[PDB]
C-alpha cells in the first residue's frame, strides 16, 4: 500500500492562517480528483472539512481551501478560531472503490488566552447518604492551560489514596474540564469538619472547603 | 444532514464476534443504503472496513460486515483480537455537501476486567444556588470499559443545551470515572421540577432522576 505524506502538526496563531499538506501520489493526490480534509474535534468522529477539493459541506464555513499543483496538494484555513486547533487529516481517492489517508495540521491555534478554573467543590447527596455512602468532589471548568494540580485537605490535612481525579479535555471545543472525587466514609466525613479541595494551576490556588452543614 | 446512533462501546473478548448498529432517519438510512464504516483507532487516519456496506475494501479480512435492517446498521468482526479496539465509524452520504458518521464504537481482548460504572446526581448547594449560579454534576465511576454515554433531562425533556461531558480519566486500579457538568445558574434549576443525569454502558443504562429543593 505504502501509505501517504501529511504533516504531524501545523502552527498558526488565533486569527491566523492554515496551510495543510499532503504528499500522495499519481493516483491519488497526484492524479486523479477526489480529495478530502477531515476535522476531528479529535474526540467526536472525523467529519470532512473540504471535499471534492475545496468543496465546503453544509455550514462548513469557508475559511478553508482546497489546493494543490500536483501530487502534492495543500488546503489553507484564513484566520483561526482555536475550534480551528483539531486534527486535520487528508486523503486522496484510488484507483476504485478504495482512497488514502494521512495525518496532520491545524492543529495548533495560539493567540488562545489563558485562564483559570473555576473549582466548584460538592459534598455527597442525600440517596448515597440514605445509602450509606459518600463521595466528595471538586469540579473544574474554565481554564485554558489543563495541567491542574488539584488537592485533597482533610480538617486541614493532606488526604492520601482515597481520592481520584483524570486528565480533564475540552469543553465545546475551547478549553477543559477537570474533577477530582475524594470516595469515602460518612463515617470519617462525618467526623472530620473541614472538607477542601484546591487546584493549583499556573502560580495561583484556589481551595474550596465543605463543613457538616446544608441541609441534605 | 448528520443523525447516527451507533453503539457506544461493543464489548471485546478474546476469540469472539461483534457487532454494532448505527442510525438516523427514514429519507437517507431507510430509504436508500447509505452509511460505509471505519476504522479508526488509537489516532490514526481511519481506514476503510465497509465500503458501500456488502462489500469490504479489499485487502480487508472478511470478518467484519455491514448490516441494516433498513431502518439502521449493524457490524460484526468474527474473531476477536488485539489489532481490533479502534473507533469505529459511519457514515450515510449526503446532499452533495451531507454525508454523515455515527459517533463510534470502540474493541477489546486481553487481560480485561467486565463491569459496570457507578453514576451520581449532586444537584447543587445552597452558596452556589447562592447569587447567581448552579451547575449539577453527575460523575460516572469505576467502570471496567468506560465509553459510557451521558445524558441529562429534567422534567422529562433530553438536553445538551446544557451540559459538557468529563471524559473517564484513569482511576489507577485500571478502572474507569467520568463526569457530567451540566449549569444553569439558577433559572432551569429552579425553573423545573427534577432532573436527571443517566448513562448507558455496554449493556448497562443506569439513570440518575432527581429534584430540587429549598435546603436548610
Redesign the interface.
Same mark, same amino acid.
Given at each position: 500500500?505504502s501509505a %501517504?505524506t501529511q504533516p504531524p502538526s501545523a502552527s498558526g496563531s488565533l486569527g491566523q492562517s492554515v496551510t495543510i499538506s499532503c504528499t500522495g501520489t499519481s493516483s491519488d493526490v497526484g492524479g486523479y480528483n477526489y480529495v478530502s480534509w477531515y476535522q476531528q474535534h479529535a #474526540?467526536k468522529?472525523? &467529519? /470532512?472539512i473540504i471535499?471534492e477539493v475545496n &468543496?465546503?459541506? =453544509?455550514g462548513?464555513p469557508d475559511r478553508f481551501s482546497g489546493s494543490k499543483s500536483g501530487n502534492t496538494a495543500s488546503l489553507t484555513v484564513s484566520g483561526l478560531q482555536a475550534e480551528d486547533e483539531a486534527?486535520y487529516?487528508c486523503?486522496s481517492y484510488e484507483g476504485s472503490?478504495? !482512497?488514502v !489517508? #494521512?495525518?496532520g495540521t491545524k492543529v495548533t491555534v495560539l493567540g488562545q488566552p489563558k485562564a483559570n478554573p473555576t473549582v466548584?467543590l !460538592?459534598? +455527597?447527596?442525600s440517596?448515597?447518604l440514605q445509602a450509606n455512602k459518600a463521595?466528595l468532589?471538586c %469540579?473544574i471548568?474554565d481554564f485554558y492551560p489543563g495541567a491542574v494540580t488539584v488537592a485533597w485537605k482533610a480538617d486541614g490535612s493532606p488526604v492520601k489514596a482515597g481520592v481520584?481525579?483524570? &486528565? +480533564?479535555?475540552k469543553? =465545546?471545543n475551547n478549553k477543559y474540564?477537570?474533577?477530582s472525587?475524594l =470516595?469515602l466514609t460518612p463515617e470519617q466525613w462525618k467526623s472530620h469538619r473541614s472538607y477542601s479541595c484546591q487546584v493549583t494551576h499556573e502560580g495561583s490556588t484556589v481551595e474550596k472547603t /465543605?463543613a457538616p452543614t446544608?441541609? =441534605?
Open positions: 500500500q %501517504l #474526540g468522529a472525523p &467529519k /470532512v471535499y &468543496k465546503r459541506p =453544509s462548513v486534527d487529516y486523503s472503490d478504495n !482512497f !489517508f #494521512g495525518t466548584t !460538592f459534598p +455527597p447527596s440517596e448515597e463521595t468532589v %469540579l471548568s481520584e481525579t483524570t &486528565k +480533564p479535555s469543553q =465545546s474540564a477537570a474533577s472525587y =470516595s /465543605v446544608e441541609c =441534605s
